[PDB]
Write an enzyme that holds these catalytic residues in place. Structure first.
Site, PDB file in Angstrom:
ATOM      1  N   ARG A 257       0.324  19.189  -9.730  1.00  0.00           N
ATOM      2  CA  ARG A 257       1.373  19.713 -10.589  1.00  0.00           C
ATOM      3  C   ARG A 257       2.705  19.732  -9.849  1.00  0.00           C
ATOM      4  NH1 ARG A 257      -2.518  24.767 -12.192  1.00  0.00           N
ATOM      5  NH2 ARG A 257      -2.288  24.891  -9.917  1.00  0.00           N
ATOM      6  N   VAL A 258       3.739  19.203 -10.505  1.00  0.00           N
ATOM      7  CA  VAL A 258       5.081  19.209  -9.939  1.00  0.00           C
ATOM      8  C   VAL A 258       5.588  20.641  -9.820  1.00  0.00           C
ATOM      9  CG1 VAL A 258       7.483  18.444 -10.291  1.00  0.00           C
ATOM     10  CG2 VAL A 258       5.544  16.915 -10.843  1.00  0.00           C
TER      11      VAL A 258
ATOM     12  N   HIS B 240       0.818  -1.212   0.000  1.00  0.00           N
ATOM     13  CA  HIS B 240       0.000   0.000   0.000  1.00  0.00           C
ATOM     14  C   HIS B 240       0.854   1.266   0.000  1.00  0.00           C
ATOM     15  CE1 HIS B 240      -3.761  -2.120   1.953  1.00  0.00           C
ATOM     16  NE2 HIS B 240      -3.167  -2.874   1.042  1.00  0.00           N
TER      17      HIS B 240
END
Ligand SMILES: *[C@@H]1O[C@H](CO)[C@@H](O[C@@H]2O[C@H](CO)[C@@H](O[C@@H]3O[C@H](CO[C@@H]4O[C@H](CO[C@H]5O[C@H](CO)[C@@H](O)[C@H](O)[C@@H]5O)[C@@H](O)[C@H](O[C@H]5O[C@H](CO)[C@@H](O)[C@H](O)[C@@H]5O)[C@@H]4O)[C@@H](O)[C@H](O[C@H]4O[C@H](CO)[C@@H](O)[C@H](O)[C@@H]4O[C@H]4O[C@H](CO)[C@@H](O)[C@H](O)[C@@H]4O)[C@@H]3O)[C@H](O)[C@H]2NC(C)=O)[C@H](O)[C@H]1NC(C)=O
Ligand SMILES: *[C@@H]1O[C@H](CO)[C@@H](O[C@@H]2O[C@H](CO)[C@@H](O[C@@H]3O[C@H](CO[C@H]4O[C@H](CO)[C@@H](O)[C@H](O)[C@@H]4O)[C@@H](O)[C@H](O[C@H]4O[C@H](CO)[C@@H](O)[C@H](O)[C@@H]4O[C@H]4O[C@H](CO)[C@@H](O)[C@H](O)[C@@H]4O)[C@@H]3O)[C@H](O)[C@H]2NC(C)=O)[C@H](O)[C@H]1NC(C)=O
Ligand SMILES: Cc1cc2nc3c(=O)[nH]c(=O)nc-3n(C[C@H](O)[C@H](O)[C@H](O)COP(=O)(O)OP(=O)(O)OC[C@H]3O[C@@H](n4cnc5c(N)ncnc54)[C@H](O)[C@@H]3O)c2cc1C
Ligand SMILES: Cc1cc2nc3c(=O)[nH]c(=O)nc-3n(C[C@H](O)[C@H](O)[C@H](O)COP(=O)(O)OP(=O)(O)OC[C@H]3O[C@@H](n4cnc5c(N)ncnc54)[C@H](O)[C@@H]3O)c2cc1C
Ligand SMILES: *[C@@H]1O[C@H](CO)[C@@H](O[C@@H]2O[C@H](CO)[C@@H](O)[C@H](O)[C@H]2NC(C)=O)[C@H](O)[C@H]1NC(C)=O
Ligand SMILES: *[C@@H]1O[C@H](CO)[C@@H](O[C@@H]2O[C@H](CO)[C@@H](O)[C@H](O)[C@H]2NC(C)=O)[C@H](O)[C@H]1NC(C)=O
Ligand SMILES: *[C@@H]1O[C@H](CO)[C@@H](O[C@@H]2O[C@H](CO)[C@@H](O)[C@H](O)[C@H]2NC(C)=O)[C@H](O)[C@H]1NC(C)=O
Ligand SMILES: *[C@@H]1O[C@H](CO)[C@@H](O[C@@H]2O[C@H](CO)[C@@H](O)[C@H](O)[C@H]2NC(C)=O)[C@H](O)[C@H]1NC(C)=O
Ligand SMILES: *[C@@H]1O[C@H](CO)[C@@H](O[C@@H]2O[C@H](CO)[C@@H](O)[C@H](O)[C@H]2NC(C)=O)[C@H](O)[C@H]1NC(C)=O
Ligand SMILES: *[C@@H]1O[C@H](CO)[C@@H](O)[C@H](O)[C@H]1NC(C)=O
Ligand SMILES: *[C@@H]1O[C@H](CO)[C@@H](O)[C@H](O)[C@H]1NC(C)=O
Ligand SMILES: *[C@@H]1O[C@H](CO)[C@@H](O)[C@H](O)[C@H]1NC(C)=O
Ligand SMILES: [Ba+2]
Ligand SMILES: [Ba+2]
Ligand SMILES: [Ba+2]
Ligand SMILES: [Ba+2]
Ligand SMILES: [Ba+2]
Ligand SMILES: [Ba+2]
Ligand SMILES: [Ba+2]
Ligand SMILES: [Ba+2]
Ligand SMILES: [Ba+2]
Ligand SMILES: [Ba+2]
Ligand SMILES: [Ba+2]
Ligand SMILES: [Ba+2]
Ligand SMILES: [Br-]
Ligand SMILES: [Br-]
Ligand SMILES: [Br-]
Ligand SMILES: [Cl-]
Ligand SMILES: [Cl-]
Ligand SMILES: [Cl-]
Ligand SMILES: [Cl-]
Ligand SMILES: [Cl-]
Ligand SMILES: [Cl-]
Ligand SMILES: [Cl-]
Ligand SMILES: [Cl-]
Ligand SMILES: [Cl-]
Ligand SMILES: [Cl-]
Ligand code: NA
Ligand code: NA
Ligand code: NA
Ligand code: NA
Ligand code: NA
Ligand code: NA
Lengths: 582, 581
Positions: B535-536, B514
């Site tokens: 968003r990076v 997990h």
């Protein structure tokens, strides 16, 4: 434009075409055989390899001192075993994925077995012509050895030029990182000399016993001599030699229109539903490794009906494919060293049965003298073999090796380079395991690989005694000068542990040795074999298994020297038949 | 048919431009591919390392065959480092094919505690990421079926207001056709004796007690893998392309602007035979928590301390690959009487105090006094970079435990001929990492270290939870069916105390598979890698949309959240598309 540009990657380049020979697997035996066959310009060969070209990657491949860094990468198949009965854990089988096979990822150790072990392939396993003198001659022919220099001799090397070829193909010589050699190698030699054990025997001469250094499979500049570099790179421009990378051979195509089935080609691909066929005018040669070649047969309908029928595969030829699997178990003893022990160097103690067991020798011999029949019945009951009488012949052969020839029974492999570290394995396991497919789709790679480690009591006792011996010798005689405390087992096993304590510890602190053989054993059909003395599968025309699947026994050595010789010897048989089929 | 529509030849896409490239055709990737291509004018290319498996047969389609697929070509079987807790390597099961790990998972369909999702907004600064919003997307994804009378009699309880019935992912009770085992209700009675609730609907936001649950399968019991649910109905869309059998190696970056921009990806299977494909709008990483961070690192997005020694220029310096959070699982198994026969699964979501029992005082004292020391130690091991920021995570977990009393461990019961518990500490304090070890993406040479049991509370909690599973297996109504323990069995004395369990557990556990957090969605100042639209940071046109981004673990099975996550991110992507036209 270089070897890489010559390699094929598009299945459409070979789909539907016919070549003389198809080789499944571009590893040690596959590339040696492909090179040998394509020396004749009229013989066309197609090698199909699941991996790609790796010899130029850099140190992770080319530096033998980086051994192990490649594990777990795309160049390691990492085959998973079943949940092992000895410890209820799954183990990983390291195995090279790429041109050169496991020679891309191995330790580079270059030694030969005991003469009596190879001789028994002829006298016990009915393989005419498979004796030491014949196999050793092929081994020397493959070998291109370099004698040690004065620095290397002074460190402990001994090289008997009469036991080595110097004009062959596989470059071999002393590992030399450029630094000084550790005095610990000579200290180990002195320590066993105190006990009457020999040292400095050349382990290529047919009597591997005692403590010696050895050559490695590398060029003088220390670049790894992987089988692709040695056998493919010099010859890739041959127009009759084709190599397809990135594809798995799934099964052998069989024609049953004749009186006996004949291998006419292979199916290859990477996923069910997107396969392609390629055809062989003469023969299909399986060289995918001891873990894979038997599964290829089973996917083809060649194997035991008890296995194939439940999977929905028609049994075309019933043979005990996948049985008689023999791998060794390895454990570690590691100690810190004094600054005076610094330097490079490897060595190995090939220890006899009595050297291994010490004061337990009498009890161990009593087991060997009384239990072989019961051990064989139990291994057969576990599915490691099918015919108890036939297995007992193997066990009696090992007893003969031990009692009458005093062959090496365990190997204690020493690494230095800043520590004193032994990898230790029982060389002659009596356990027998199996590998069987679990599905009809070759590209699902769903299989059960069970070497049955430690399910024979002598294998567990022998491993325990050998590993205890490694602890003992690490702090005996001249080795005491350099001993600075054990780190493995260290706190995990009391330093004064007796043999019974070692036997309880070992099942939870070992690894496969990755020396698995025997899954398509070369011995008579009546003895449980799968191929004859020319490597041909019984009851099938034009089909051979040429890799580590076929040795019927283990051996007291590292196997490259024998497997290169094996491939050359089988290649001669292939070429003899080619001339007849004209 | 779908198979014929799939692309296998890299030359079909090489050099071309599409609107969106999705790396990975798993749960989040295929959900997002479906949402984006509902507009016929938006082109999407999915690149997946595996192939189509949903029609293979029972090994995929029957949830009762769970585990048979492991070790096959449909299992990536990622290897960990040599773990410090036991000096052994572990295997991370992970699905390889269209649908990702939804092809190979256990099918359990549950949701976390409201307070856990809410903290994503209040603690981790993700505006709009709260229970109400995320759950709404979860119900929108869901197509649930109420249990029938046989299934209710076995122990099912279904609160219709907590479930969507007109969505996409088919979910309902597992039903093999056999009788349901009485052991499920026996477990419910056993915990009732101890003051534990039962039959809560684990989809409603309070996962606590012993309940049954839906599974991701159709009524005919065929597995509802993400490819079957999101790709098979839509593969005929000409603007939806799926390339199989290929790995995305890295993101192609343009530094022509003031900030780097993702303009495409390189894909292939081996160095020297790679191909480029370009994205007009955005690149979306959905290759899984073990992989998406490595794709960033191969691209030059990550920590200089990691990239420079490998010869990779750091284009954007971010703590990529840190904050890995996976759980540890151990097993307690017992034979049953013939009267216990039948099908059925259930789970005990157990609180901190339920898990620890008489050790609760001892465990709380550690939780109240050592968080700063623990955070320093995790940072020193490379599981995180900023101790102050990690301490915020630890105090969040403490708040969950003491003030909301969320479930701390899960005891998952399987019957069908035995009584078998898989048991895991849901909220590990250890933090791990994944980092590339080579510059060649196609070598797949990486170090994946979840650092299991390197936090002392994680080991104590796992030991206490697993000891509890043995205890409850032979308590109250469960005694009627107990016929002897087989695991640990002879490997651990039946009267073992907690200290004996703590020495046993490191050598008798598996990963839970997990793993989350390797591209955590939280402010850059807290160690995050992506913002609240995935968003990076410091890169234009690049998102990570998969299990890499959850900043915390959660007291539940994650599919309900990940489907919701994908839909929510898809809405953000489409709103930006529309606004920018
Ligand atoms: C790897 O993992 C495996 C597990 O996956 C593990 O193998 C298990 O090992 C455990 C021991 O730890 C063992 O469990 C014990 O089982 C005893 C029962 O004996 C069995 O009875 C079974 C049931 O029989 C009925 O049902 C079957 C099927 O319906 C029918 O066929 C029968 O006719 C009958 O109606 C049988 O299935 C079983 O046969 C199997 O095993 C044999 C092997 O000899 C094999 O040939 C055959 O094919 C079958 O597979 C066998 O007859 C049971 O008595 C034990 O209970 C004691 O101990 C537990 C644990 O401490 C206590 O809870 C109990 O109360 C009881 O305690 C008593 O004894 C204690 C001493 O141990 C003592 O402390 C106490 O005071 C009491 O006196 C126990 O449950 C299990 O059977 C193994 N196998 C399986 C599949 O689970 C293996 O060891 C692991 N290996 C490693 C290296 O770790
Ligand atoms: C996973 O595997 C790693 C190994 O890869 C293992 O870590 C190693 O653990 C061992 C212990 O099992 C450590 O070895 C011990 O080290 C100390 C010295 O450590 C200090 O000093 C060294 C430099 O000298 C530093 O590098 C280090 O950081 C420390 O500062 C020694 O004291 C130990 O030696 C004693 O025990 C040995 C074994 O029993 C003896 O051979 C030795 O003579 C000493 O024995 C006894 O001395 C007296 C004689 O009776 C007596 O007082 C005591 O009995 C005493 O034991 C020992 O060598 C090793 O440093 C660790 N690290 C490495 C890299 O090797 C992990 O523990 C393992 N993890 C798991 C979970 O299994
Ligand atoms: C970790 C390790 C260390 C070792 N150390 C030593 C040592 O120190 N000294 C020594 O002498 N020997 C050593 N060996 C042994 C030696 O490396 C092998 O025994 C030898 O390489 C076996 O040769 P082979 O041709 O049977 O198989 P391999 O060389 O393994 O070749 C089989 C090839 O087939 C490919 N293949 C697999 N499946 C398929 C398929 N379906 N279709 C097509 N291709 C396929 C593989 O990718 C591989 O290239 C070591 C082995 C290992 C694993
Ligand atoms: C054994 C197991 C059991 C589970 N049980 C449950 C359960 O009972 N209930 C529950 O809710 N959840 C469960 N899960 C969790 C669920 O399956 C995953 O959390 C979910 O599938 C994650 O979605 P994802 O999109 O992040 O990644 P995935 O679904 O793993 O998708 C990643 C995809 O990317 C592909 N890929 C990888 N590398 C590349 C590359 N370089 N280029 C292109 N493609 C690539 C993979 O092959 C895969 O298809 C389980 C997981 C596992 C492993
Ligand atoms: C290894 O040790 C064994 C056991 O101590 C020795 O075996 C005995 O050897 C004598 C002489 O040949 C036989 O008569 C006995 O029957 C053997 N005993 C057993 C139990 O087999 C053996 O000699 C030793 N070998 C070496 C090479 O030293
Ligand atoms: C089991 O293996 C044994 C040993 O290889 C086989 O025994 C041989 O059988 C042949 C044919 O019956 C006889 O001519 C030989 O004399 C036997 N040799 C020995 C040493 O006993 C036997 O055939 C095998 N049986 C099965 C069913 O596989
Ligand atoms: C969980 O257990 C803890 C510790 O046993 C409980 O907190 C303690 O409560 C007692 C009784 O009120 C106090 O005397 C202690 O000072 C408390 N200790 C700590 C460290 O807080 C707690 O109430 C329990 N929680 C639940 C929900 O039952
Ligand atoms: C380490 O993490 C902490 C927690 O996010 C950061 O500390 C914050 O620092 C900023 C800027 O100096 C302040 O506005 C906050 O008030 C701080 N918060 C707390 C709770 O102390 C810190 O910036 C991080 N370090 C780095 C280099 O990013
Ligand atoms: C199973 O767990 C229960 C509850 O933790 C144990 O019963 C407890 O025994 C302790 C020790 O004397 C007491 O402090 C508790 O009050 C008891 N609880 C109840 C409800 O009576 C029980 O002993 C455990 N079983 C085993 C076999 O260890
Ligand atoms: C070298 O090898 C040959 C052949 O095995 C042997 O006759 C010769 O005596 C060996 N020399 C030494 C010094 O061992
Ligand atoms: C190792 O040392 C112990 C203790 O002296 C001894 O009993 C044992 O036999 C030794 N092992 C070997 C193989 O010599
Ligand atoms: C269903 O769950 C909701 C949300 O928690 C709750 O308000 C409601 O009371 C529940 N209904 C039933 C019938 O249990
Ligand atoms: Ba030499
Ligand atoms: Ba040379
Ligand atoms: Ba001797
Ligand atoms: Ba040194
Ligand atoms: Ba098939
Ligand atoms: Ba070898
Ligand atoms: Ba329900
Ligand atoms: Ba069931
Ligand atoms: Ba504190
Ligand atoms: Ba490169
Ligand atoms: Ba940081
Ligand atoms: Ba889950
Ligand atoms: Br060395
Ligand atoms: Br409810
Ligand atoms: Br349905
Ligand atoms: Cl080169
Ligand atoms: Cl390298
Ligand atoms: Cl080991
Ligand atoms: Cl291509
Ligand atoms: Cl291009
Ligand atoms: Cl199937
Ligand atoms: Cl939707
Ligand atoms: Cl209901
Ligand atoms: Cl359409
Ligand atoms: Cl233990
Ligand atoms: Na000895
Ligand atoms: Na595997
Ligand atoms: Na599971
Ligand atoms: Na809805
Ligand atoms: Na914890
Ligand atoms: Na954020």
């Amino acid at each position: 434009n270089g070897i890489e540009a010559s390699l094929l990657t598009d299945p459409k380049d070979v789909s539907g075409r016919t070549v003389d020979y198809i080789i499944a697997g571009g590893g040690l035996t596959g590339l040696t055989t492909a090179a040998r066959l394509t020396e004749n310009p009229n013989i066309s060969v197609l090698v199909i390899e699941s991996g790609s070209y790796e010899s130029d990657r850099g140190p992770i491949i080319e530096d033998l001192n980086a051994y192990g860094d490649i594990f777990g990468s795309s160049v390691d198949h990492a085959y998973e075993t079943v949940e092992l009965a000895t410890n209820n854990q799954t183990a990983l089988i390291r195995s090279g994925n790429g041109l050169g096979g496991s020679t891309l990822v191995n330790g580079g150790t270059w030694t030969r077995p005991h003469k009596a072990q190879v001789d028994s392939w002829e006298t016990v396993f009915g393989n005419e012509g498979w004796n030491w003198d014949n196999v050793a001659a092929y081994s020397l022919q493959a070998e291109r050895a370099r004698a040690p220099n004065a620095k290397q001799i002074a460190a402990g090397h001994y090289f008997n030029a009469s036991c080595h070829g110097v004009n062959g193909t596989v470059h071999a010589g002393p590992r030399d990182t450029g630094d000084d050699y550790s005095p610990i190698v000579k200290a180990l030699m002195s320590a066993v000399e105190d006990r009457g054990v020999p040292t400095k025997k050349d382990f290529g001469c047919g009597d591997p016993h005692g403590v010696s250094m050895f050559p490695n499979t590398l060029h003088e500049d220390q670049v790894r001599s992987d089988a692709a570099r040695e056998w493919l790179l010099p010859n890739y421009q041959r127009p009759n030699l084709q190599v397809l990378t990135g594809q798995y051979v799934g099964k052998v195509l069989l024609s049953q229109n004749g009186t006996t089935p004949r291998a006419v080609g292979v199916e290859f691909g990477t996923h069910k539903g997107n396969t392609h066929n390629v055809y062989a005018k003469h023969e299909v040669l399986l060289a995918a490794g001891s873990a894979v070649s038997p599964t290829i047969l089973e996917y083809s309908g060649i194997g035991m009906k008890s296995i194939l029928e439940p999977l929905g595969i028609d049994t075309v030829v019933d043979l005990p494919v996948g049985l008689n699997l023999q791998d060794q178990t390895t454990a570690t003893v590691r100690s810190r060293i004094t600054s005076a022990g610094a330097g490079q160097g490897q060595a190995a103690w090939f220890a006899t049965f009595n050297e291994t067991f010490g004061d337990y020798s009498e009890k161990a011999h009593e087991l060997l003298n009384t239990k072989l029949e019961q051990w064989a019945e139990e291994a057969v009951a576990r599915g490691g073999f099918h015919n108890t009488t036939a297995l007992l012949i193997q066990y009696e052969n090992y007893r003969d090796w031990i009692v009458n020839h005093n062959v090496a029974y365990s190997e204690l492999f020493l690494d230095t380079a800043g520590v004193a570290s032994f990898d230790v394995w029982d060389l002659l396991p009596f356990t027998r395991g199996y590998v069987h497919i679990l599905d009809k789709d070759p590209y699902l790679h769903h299989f059960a690989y069970d070497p049955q480690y430690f399910l024979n009591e002598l294998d567990l006792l022998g491993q325990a005694a050998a590993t205890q011996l490694a602890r003992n010798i690490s702090n005996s005689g001249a080795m005491q000068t350099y001993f600075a405390g054990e780190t493995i087992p260290g706190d995990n096993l009391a330093y004064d542990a007796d043999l019974s304590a070692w036997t309880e510890y070992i099942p939870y602190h070992f690894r496969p040795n990755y020396h698995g053989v025997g899954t398509c054993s070369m011995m008579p059909k009546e003895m449980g074999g799968v191929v004859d003395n020319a490597a041909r599968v019984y009851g099938v025309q034009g089909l051979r298994v040429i890799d580590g699947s076929i040795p019927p026994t283990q051996m007291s050595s590292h196997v490259m020297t024998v497997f290169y010789a094996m491939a050359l010897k089988i290649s001669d048989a292939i070429l003899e038949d080619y001339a007849s089929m004209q």
